[PDB]
Amino acid sequence: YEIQRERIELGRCIGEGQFGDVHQGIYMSPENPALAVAIKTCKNCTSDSVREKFLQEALTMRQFDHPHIVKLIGVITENPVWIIMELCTLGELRSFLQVRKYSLDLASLILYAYQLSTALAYLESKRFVHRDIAARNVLVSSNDCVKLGDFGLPIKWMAPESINFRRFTSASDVWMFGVCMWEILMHGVKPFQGVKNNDVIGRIENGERLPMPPNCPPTLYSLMTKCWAYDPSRRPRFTELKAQLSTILEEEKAQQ
Amino acid sequence: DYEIQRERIELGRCIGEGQFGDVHQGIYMSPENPALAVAIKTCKNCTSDSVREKFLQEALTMRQFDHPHIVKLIGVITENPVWIIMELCTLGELRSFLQVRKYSLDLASLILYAYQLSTALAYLESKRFVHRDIAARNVLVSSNDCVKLGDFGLLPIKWMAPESINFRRFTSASDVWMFGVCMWEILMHGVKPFQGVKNNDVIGRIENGERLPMPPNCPPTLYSLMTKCWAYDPSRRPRFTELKAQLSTILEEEKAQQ
Ligand SMILES: CC(C)(C)C#CCc1c[nH]c2ncsc12
Numbered sequence: 082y083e084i085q086r087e088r089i090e091l092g093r094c095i096g097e098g099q100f101g102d103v104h105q106g107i108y109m110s111p112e113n114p115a116l117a118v119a120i121k122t123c124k125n126c127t128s129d130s131v132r133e134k135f136l137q138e139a140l141t142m143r144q145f146d147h148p149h150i151v152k153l154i155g156v157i158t159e160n161p162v163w164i165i166m167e168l169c170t171l172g173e174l175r176s177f178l179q180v181r182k183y184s185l186d187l188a189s190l191i192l193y194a195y196q197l198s199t200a201l202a203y204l205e206s207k208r209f210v211h212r213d214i215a216a217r218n219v220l221v222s223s224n225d226c227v228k229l230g231d232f233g234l235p236i237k238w239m240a241p242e243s244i245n246f247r248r249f250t251s252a253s254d255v256w257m258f259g260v261c262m263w264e265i266l267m268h269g270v271k272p273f274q275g276v277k278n279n280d281v282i283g284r285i286e287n288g289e290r291l292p293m294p295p296n297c298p299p300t301l302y303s304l305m306t307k308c309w310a311y312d313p314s315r316r317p318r319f320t321e322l323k324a325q326l327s328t329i330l331e332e333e334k335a336q337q
Numbered sequence: 338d339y340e341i342q343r344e345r346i347e348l349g350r351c352i353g354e355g356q357f358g359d360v361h362q363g364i365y366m367s368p369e370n371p372a373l374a375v376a377i378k379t380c381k382n383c384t385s386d387s388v389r390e391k392f393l394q395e396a397l398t399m400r401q402f403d404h405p406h407i408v409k410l411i412g413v414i415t416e417n418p419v420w421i422i423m424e425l426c427t428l429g430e431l432r433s434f435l436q437v438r439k440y441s442l443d444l445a446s447l448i449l450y451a452y453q454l455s456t457a458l459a460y461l462e463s464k465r466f467v468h469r470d471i472a473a474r475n476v477l478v479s480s481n482d483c484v485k486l487g488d489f490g491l492l493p494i495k496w497m498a499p500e501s502i503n504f505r506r507f508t509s510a511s512d513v514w515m516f517g518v519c520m521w522e523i524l525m526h527g528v529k530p531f532q533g534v535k536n537n538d539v540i541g542r543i544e545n546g547e548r549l550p551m552p553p554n555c556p557p558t559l560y561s562l563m564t565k566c567w568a569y570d571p572s573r574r575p576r577f578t579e580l581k582a583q584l585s586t587i588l589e590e591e592k593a594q595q
């Protein structure tokens with residue numbers, strides 16, 4: 082919904098998005114007392130083509146209602162164009178995992194993988210294909226809560242059919258999810274560091290896969306390997322992934 | 338932790354309908370204590386994660402409380418079908434109870450129920466908890482002399498304070514307005530407020546200064562207390578400490594008259 086600019090107080094810059102800086106701020110509505118929010122800005126939204134692309138993310142996001150998907154609060158469609166969203170105070174997942182590398186237990190890493198699998202099972206139930214599942218698109222709401230935060234080529238995360246044929250399906254999202262799980266267990270390290278994008282497909286074609294992260298339970302790595310079946314029809318769906326991640330998380334909690 | 342094994346619950350008959358689904362009575366076989374009759378809240382749409390979160394948040398809310406006039410949380414079953422296990426109030430829903438006992442309940446019993454609910458609400462106020470859905474439909478009857486606030490799941494326009502209707506603002510003051518409506522329902526033996534009036538016409542009447550009339554046999558002191566609950570300005574409404582004290586005095590005056 083359209084928000085009056087007077088109801089938004091722009092605060093500190095908290096990140097840099099594809100369209101411009103992201104700020105934290107305050108939304109003052111008659112409904113709720115003053116609420117801390119995130120504000121996506123758009124440097125070049127004076128251009129109608131750029132504005133259409135920027136605002137398309139808000140249109141997509143408004144369709145969802147899930148505990149692990151960031152909520153759209155509203156939009157300001159007059160220049161400067163702003164998207165108002167739910168604030169995830171701990172910020173981007175990659176930076177969070179890198180900073181907390183030796184303070185986050187394995188059970189926390191598996192929990193994040195599980196939570197994202199519930200958001201993705203929800204998207205799958207709505208026949209929605211994300212096309213860009215990666216740790217860089219996840220936000221941290223609290224130490225125990227992550228959310229899919231961006232609905233705006235990444236060769237290193239892509240399923241072979243997406244690279245080869247530009248085919249993006251529920252099965253290609255599962256491949257990308259497997260890469261995202263690897264990134265979480267690697268504490269925010271990017272896949273195939275130093276490898277050229279053009280060499281990635283060749284290695285993948287040859288049967289090579291991202292290695293087991295240190296301290297990753299073998300059951301969880303077996304789940305990642307299933308996400309990376311070359312044949313998309315052999316990849317699990319999110320119902321099975323969610324169920325398996327829940328069992329893996331319970332086994333880790335029981336161990337510790 | 339409040340997780341209970343499903344094998345320890347024997348699901349019995351349906352005893353009512355809640356916001357999330359049917360409520361059943363059943364039996365809880367705890368490891369140490371004797372078999373206990375319990376109420377089981379079910380959730381028709383808990384396959385939806387958003388709905389499941391809301392349903393389980395009611396149990397997490399109820400877990401925070403311990404009061405003689407608030408239904409006790411016994412436990413939860415977090416696997417599908419998701420259930421909330423709670424204290425069973427054998428006489429059931431307050432509205433049906435007041436309607437059936439319309440010619441057998443004395444005024445002192447009606448005032449006692451208003452007083453008991455005011456003690457549960459003073460307790461919730463002491464914990465800075467805003468209910469947002471105070472209504473006779475959310476009250477259960479434990480015995481002829483004991484009522485309990487029974488639901489914490491949450492539009493109830495006909496019970497709502499004007500700021501809640503106009504601005505979606507819910508505060509301790511808006512709960513007092515709703516409590517005033519609940520007191521009116523009790524004194525009316527379970528008749529709903531504004532029967533036949535459309536929800537959209539409610540705000541217009543309130544803003545013309547219209548209020549629910551004095552129930553027959555309601556002591557003028559008690560109706561004066563309901564009118565204070567319905568001050569348009571939220572800052573002019575009493576708090577539950579004052580309401581509890583005034584209801585206690587009114588109950589004692591009725592008992593003395595009898
Ligand atoms: C990843 C990046 C650039 C920080 C972003 C963004 C959009 C956003 C939505 N909510 C929220 N909370 C913290 S950043 C953010």
Ligand SMILES: CC(C)(C)C#CCc1c[nH]c2ncsc12
Pocket residue numbers: 352353354355356360376408423424425426427428429430474475476477487488
């Ligand atoms: C809590 C709610 C939804 C008002 C209900 C109900 C039906 C019911 C009858 N007896 C009883 N005891 C505990 S809940 C219940």
